Write a protein that binds this DNA or RNA. Structure first.
Lengths: 534, 30, 103, 355
RNA sequence: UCCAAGGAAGGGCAGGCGCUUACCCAAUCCUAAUUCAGGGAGGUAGUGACAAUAAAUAACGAUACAGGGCCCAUUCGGGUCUUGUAAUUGGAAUGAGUACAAUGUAAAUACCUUAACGAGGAACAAUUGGAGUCUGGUCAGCAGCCGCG
């Protein structure tokens, strides 16, 4: 409530409205984009150099964003931060099982003001049956998904697209209807990059090598909480890693001064102002005689009773200089203590919708924790008696496990996103979803119960007087373990009486019932061996 | 969702009971 | 309720029950404070699981038991149930007909 | 390892400042000019008390003890029992974990053993009724100090149990601009191995002092004899003032050495209680470092605290310099508009979780 | 409201949400600088479970091994045995949907017609439910012997 409340007041016209046009790359999104800026700038601009600042009135500034479905990371990255998702559809999607999984991504990141727009339906259909198909796709989304949504139907009038009332209806819905707040995004200061400049500290032999990082000066406008609150703080760059800011800049007898001037002793602060160790809890007082004489009278206490930024970096290093490009949009993240630190963390999980595989402990996963994403080996476990007694190596339809693994440690227990990577030539989206839930709880230095089974088959049994034909082969092991308590698969207690000088599996052992020949004498509580670290 | 229902719908669902009742009531009235 | 048929509240904590059939497993209750009133009332979750699903601190919807108060079986003293957490209509999440939002 | 501190000054402070922040620090040059350089016995056992409740914490100390590298872990806690040395009472060791109590993953159920009082550290009633009602103003609803036995120096023989039940994620916002009105004054006069009349000797000394006031004077006599009294004879007194409107307290304490006059002790703790009222605005001067810790660690919000110029001393200034070396936090002060007195307002933004 | 600093200009007005409006003077009449053409007159298109209409999801044969088959009385028991398990298998069939041409023609669209395609169960993909003394899985807690959910 308060974390959404701090966002509404300082933000005005120079912080723009976040616009993310996200759809399939096969469609002509660019015509609708340049049509949208034909509504903004007078009638005459149809060139794309985005992202860039477009000044349109004092009401709202609007910066427009785009990303293809062929890029994998920004498919994650734009979803948690967008105030507006504009989905354009073709007339042949809806049970396309490989290129529509981003809907679940926007679900798990949280739904902003989102849009469905149908334009290639004009290019595909030419009969009266499209009116039923429009309503059917409306029964698919978003009206199935969220109540109060609108489906926009527009013309295929490719280059040469209208300036007329339809773009004023789209921009009517964009300009009038505003967003809904997000919990942990507003808990952090985050800045999208707008202008990207590079300074090299002019030419020297130290300005280039195998390892040389230069002075990257980056610029833009702020969103969320104000980022200048502490200099030299930590930061995350998505896809590259964690860093700290080199220098932060922003372009939109006084005792309180005497405290934090550290070149002055505190006796000089008191002495210039008026007129040692806190390990002693009892405060200072005067002498018993002076305080007694002064407090002969008690009169003296008788009333006591009844935004633009200019940001400096000495990063990135040399290898990402070769990774320069026209800017596919990168937002800046924010690192925090009790989240920057590492630890074993336990997460609660469930299975993806329209998902067709099992999820094993041994197949590493990409994990979206806030602004972070880590490939990590997902070790599973379950309880069956309000405590851990077993573990599982894969994820069936039967139950759904809880994950325990060494990752980064995060106390506030953020929501969870577990994505399995596919290549850019397998299905059609940058990732395929494995599991989702919340970070359950924080637990380091914990140990998993890994129990196993020892096989012993009974054949002719009495209660206290019994032999097994084959469960062991050594009398010394049984002699070491005669003090233990042996079990049976139906739950019959027992203990080893003695190996009785027979290293053959025959040995005297007691039970509290005669063991069934359909039952098996077993042993549990086995070795808990270590976590996979990665 | 369950793949259990295979049983008829409507008229064929109405068809099966009258065939059953013709077997049932004939031995019942005898 | 104030005589009403439904009300909207927020989970503050999640309790624990147990069962007898087919084994002993937790059957789940909670404590939900009314938004309009501030009264915190016990509520039951009729399903298997769904302790996984609901949460602490979520804004939920409440309904009756269809017996004019009057706790159903061996559940001592609960008069209400949850049908919609976050307005998502639990049964939709029960098969997989819906996916839970950001919070 | 990076944030460098000097000397043995504010030793319990610098450990807790690193622990709650999760930041690695360094403390060096500890008694380097002294004949016994480095850590003392209680400072070693202080970090033994740190290791008993935390997880993932790394402590590296030089061989002479003059240089300590502290790297903190998570706060877990639980149930345990610690032995305190003869150098410091248990009130030296209650004081740091009061900062650490609500932020624990499991509750603090800790039994202390040894001496329970001194001339320099805090007393039990100064903990029970001087510092515990102060944290109750911040939402710490359930806290309990169970004194099983009293421990008198040199021998001690006392047992006290800390029970903390309220666990919160941040304290609530302070709102304190008016100087509260004291309604009544109470106190606890206690003794070990000796007469109840010696308690009455402390009673008559303060009632010689505080009969002039128009508030109630009701001092509780706390006599102990048996195995529950420890091993040494001795006595002390803590006299607490009450603001029953909101729950504000002001207290004074000292213990009695052998052969001393207990009437002068009752006179002194009464007049020190009067003097502290004249020096305070909202909290006591020793209640003040309890509070200022709870200012920064709270949620991201602006609060207000009335303070006095008499609370402004060298202990206070170094208290503000320690937080900025950890949390980079600046305290912003505005004077009061009142002309009757010369107070000012302590305005501190809580950190929330901001890096 | 603008300002070159002189002056100039408009009347506090619709409309939307809170509880997307396109086309034609072919009709009727009116006007005409009138056999021409126009008509913020007029005519056509968009909009949908609070209701609600008609009815599609399979039809008919075939053979072969086969029967402890059903009903009622929770019962103690009695009555009635024309029954299914198999793509064994076979030809029908219609139209959901795909499409020239014509009609209509505000210029004009839909509507009413129809050459040419479209079934052997993955079909050309219907439920919300209700019960269940069925089938499976190591747990208060316990030994001397047998067992609990």
């Amino acid at each position: 409530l308060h974390v959404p409340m701090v966002d509404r007041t300082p933000e005005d016209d120079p912080p723009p409205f976040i616009v993310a046009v996200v759809g399939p790359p096969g469609t002509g999104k660019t015509t609708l984009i340049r049509s949208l800026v034909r509504r903004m700038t007078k009638s005459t601009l149809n060139d794309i150099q985005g992202p860039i600042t477009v000044v349109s009135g004092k009401h709202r500034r609007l910066t427009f964003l785009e990303c293809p479905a062929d890029d994998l990371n920004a498919m994650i990255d734009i979803a948690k931060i967008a105030d507006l998702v504009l989905l354009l559809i073709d007339g042949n999607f809806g049970f396309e099982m490989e290129t529509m999984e981003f809907l679940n991504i926007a679900q798990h990141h949280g739904m902003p003001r989102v849009l469905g727009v149908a334009t290639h339906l004009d290019l595909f259909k030419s009969q009266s049956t499209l009116r039923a198909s429009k309503k059917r796709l409306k029964h698919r989304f978003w009206t199935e998904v969220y109540q109060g949504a609108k489906l926009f139907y527009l013309s295929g009038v490719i280059n040469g697209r209208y300036p007329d009332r339809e773009i004023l209806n789209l921009s009517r819905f964009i300009s009038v209807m505003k967003f809904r707040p997000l919990k942990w995004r507003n808990e952090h200061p985050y800045m999208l990059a707008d202008r990207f400049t590079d300074l090299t500290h002019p030419e020297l032999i130290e300005t280039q090598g195998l390892q040389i990082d230069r002075k990257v000066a980056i610029y833009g406008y702020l969103h969320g909480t104000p980022l200048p609150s502490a200099p030299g703080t930590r930061v995350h760059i998505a896809g590259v890693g964690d860093f700290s800011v080199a220098q932060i800049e922003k372009l939109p007898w006084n005792i309180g001064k005497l405290i934090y001037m550290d070149n002055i002793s505190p006796e000089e602060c008191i002495r210039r102002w008026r007129g040692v160790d806190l390990e002693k809890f009892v405060p200072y007082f005067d002498t018993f005689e002076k305080l007694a004489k002064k407090w002969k009278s008690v009169d003296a206490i008788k009333e006591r009773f009844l935004s633009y930024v200019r940001i400096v970096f000495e990063k990135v290093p040399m290898e990402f200089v070769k990774n320069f490009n026209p800017k596919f949009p990168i937002v800046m993240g924010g690192l925090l203590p009790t989240e920057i630190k590492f630890g074993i963390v336990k997460a609660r999980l469930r299975r993806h919708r329209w998902h067709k595989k099992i999820l094993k402990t041994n197949d590493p996963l990409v994990l979206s924790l806030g602004w972070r994403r880590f490939q990590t080996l997902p070790i599973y476990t379950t309880t069956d008696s309000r405590t851990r007694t077993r573990m599982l190596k894969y994820t069936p339809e039967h139950t759904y496990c809880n994950a325990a693994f060494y990752g980064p440690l995060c106390s506030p227990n953020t929501p969870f996103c577990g994505v399995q990577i596919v290549a850019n030539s397998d299905t059609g989206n940058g990732f395929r979803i494995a599991a989702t839930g919340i970070v359950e709880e924080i637990d380091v230095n914990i140990e998993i119960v890994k129990k196993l089974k020892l096989v012993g088959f009974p054949y002719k049994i009495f209660k206290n007087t019994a032999f097994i034909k084959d469960m062991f082969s050594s009398a010394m092991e049984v002699a070491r373990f005669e003090g233990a308590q042996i079990k049976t698969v139906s739950g019959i207690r027992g203990e080893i009486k003695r190996a009785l000088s027979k290293p053959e599996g025959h040995y005297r052992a007691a039970f509290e019932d005669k063991i069934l020949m359909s039952d098996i004498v077993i042993l549990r509580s086995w070795y808990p061996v270590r976590v996979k670290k990665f | 969702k369950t793949e259990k229902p295979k049983k008829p719908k409507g008229r064929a669902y109405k068809r099966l009971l009258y065939t059953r009742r013709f077997v049932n009531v004939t031995l019942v009235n005898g | 309720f104030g005589g009403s048929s439904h009300a909207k509240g927020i989970v503050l904590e999640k309790l624990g029950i147990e069962s007898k059939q087919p084994n002993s497993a937790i059957r789940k209750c909670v404590r939900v404070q009314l938004i309009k009133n501030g009264k915190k009332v016990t509520a039951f979750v009729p399903n298997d699981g769904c302790l996984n699903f609901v949460d602490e601190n979520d804004e939920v919807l409440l309904a009756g038991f269809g017996r004019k108060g009057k706790a159903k079986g061996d559940i001592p003293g609960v008069r209400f149930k949850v049908v919609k957490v976050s307005g998502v209509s639990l049964l939709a999440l029960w098969k997989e007909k819906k996916e839970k939002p950001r919070s | 390892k990076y944030t460098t501190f000097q000397g043995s000054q504010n030793f319990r402070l610098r450990i807790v400042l690193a622990t709650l922040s999760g930041k690695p620090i360094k403390i060096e040059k500890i008694r380097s000019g002294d004949l016994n350089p480095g850590l003392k016995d209680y400072e070693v056992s202080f970090l033994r008390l740190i290791e008993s409740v935390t997880n993932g914490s790394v402590i590296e100390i030089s061989y002479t003890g003059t240089t300590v590298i502290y790297r903190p872990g998570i706060i877990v806690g639980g149930a345990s029992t610690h032995i305190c040395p003869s150098s410091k009472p248990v009130g030296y060791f209650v004081e740091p974990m009061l900062y650490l109590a609500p932020f624990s993953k499991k509750k603090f159920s800790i039994l202390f053993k040894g001496i329970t009082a001194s001339h320099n550290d805090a007393g039990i009633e100064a903990i029970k009724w001087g510092l515990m009602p102060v944290m109750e103003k911040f939402g710490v609803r359930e806290c309990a100090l169970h004194t099983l036995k009293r421990g008198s120096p040199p021998l001690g023989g006392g047992e006290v149990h800390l029970v903390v039940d309220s666990l919160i994620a941040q304290p609530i916002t302070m709102h304190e601009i008016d100087r509260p009105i004291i309604s009544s004054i109470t106190g606890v006069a206690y003794s070990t191995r000796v007469s109840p009349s010696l308690v009455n000797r402390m009673i008559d000394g303060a009632k010689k002092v505080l009969k002039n006031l128009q508030c109630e004077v009701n001092i509780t006599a706390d006599v102990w004899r048996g195995e529950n009294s420890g091993k040494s004879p001795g006595w002390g007194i803590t006299l607490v003032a009450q603001s029953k409107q909101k729950g504000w307290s002001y207290f004074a304490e000292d213990i009695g050495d052998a052969g001393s006059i207990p009437e002068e002790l009752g006179e002194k703790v009464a007049c020190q209680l009067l003097e502290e009222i004249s020096k305070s605005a909202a909290v006591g001067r020793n209640q003040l470092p309890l509070a200022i810790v709870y200012m920064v660690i709270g949620k991201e919000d602006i609060g207000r605290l009335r303070i006095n110029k008499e609370q402004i001393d060298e202990r206070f200034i170094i208290l503000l310099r320690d937080i900025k070396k950890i949390f980079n936090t600046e305290v912003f002060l505005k004077p009061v508009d009142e002309a009757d007195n010369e107070d000012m307002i302590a305005t501190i933004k809580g950190i929330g979780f901001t890096n």
